[PDB]
């Protein structure tokens, strides 16, 4: 009773939205390296027995429509739901290719009262996107709530930029996949994410010719409203 039931016939869907190229009019830069993240995530969640669906370069309208449609599927035979968003962002917002989408709008589709086949099951939103423009300079060493059973695994602290390497992928996603590969058969998900926090915090530091952006650090943030422990086995 302390752990979510994860032996339904299917582990569940893993929806990966990978936004790399943005409409010129938005002025948003292309996100080099994001394809490496999307491929890593696809393989990682495949190995965890999720039904993975990759979507690329979605407009704000397409993001909302996809989320709505997925929330209206019958998830009765599924243990959980995973959504991964890879894009530009700011506080409370993820970008479609042509403009912003409110994160609250997306997640609301899956509220305990609005997606009944996911009520009581873990709904995980994994987000690689900026949450603002701060840089971390570091320091040298009956009923249930409708908001219950959500977890947001955010790549960076509220208010901060999030870092992505154009060759290797994002610091957060490369770390998340590595920790899942190593520990999904051994550790509870919060402990896996804590190891991701440590990996991102200790092993990465930005390199830039621009002093403003050089030698900067990142800490992801786990936002949990889960009510049980989550094991992938």
């Amino acid at each position: 009773d302390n752990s979510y039931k994860m032996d339904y016939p299917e582990m569940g869907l893993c929806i990966i939205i990978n936004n790399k190229n943005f409409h010129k009019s938005t002025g948003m830069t292309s996100r080099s390296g994001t394809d490496v993240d999307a491929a890593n995530l696809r393989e990682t969640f495949r190995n965890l027995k999720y039904e993975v669906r990759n979507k690329n370069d979605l407009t704000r309208e397409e993001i909302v429509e996809l989320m709505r449609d997925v929330s209206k599927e019958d998830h009765s035979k599924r243990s959980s739901f995973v959504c991964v968003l890879l894009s530009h962002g700011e506080a409370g917002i993820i970008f479609g290719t042509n403009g912003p989408v409110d994160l609250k709008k997306i997640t609301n589709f899956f509220r305990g009262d609005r997606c009944r086949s996911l009520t009581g099951k873990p709904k995980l939103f994994i987000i690689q996107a900026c949450r603002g423009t701060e840089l971390d300079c570091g320091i040298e060493t009956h009923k249930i709530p409708v908001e219950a059973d959500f977890l947001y695994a955010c790549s960076t602290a509220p208010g901060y930029y999030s870092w992505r390497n154009s060759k290797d992928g994002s610091w957060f996603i490369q770390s998340l996949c590595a920790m899942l590969k190593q520990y999904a058969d051994k550790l509870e998900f919060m402990h896996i994410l804590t190891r991701v926090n440590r990996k991102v915090a200790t092993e990465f530091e930005s390199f830039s010719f621009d002093a403003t952006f050089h030698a900067k650090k990142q800490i992801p943030c786990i936002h949990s409203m889960l009510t049980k422990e989550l094991y992938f086995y």
Binding site: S32, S162, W163, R164, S170, S206
Partner: peptide, 4 residues
């Protein structure tokens, strides 16, 4: 290294 780039920011999102």
């Amino acid at each position: 290294d780039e920011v999102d």
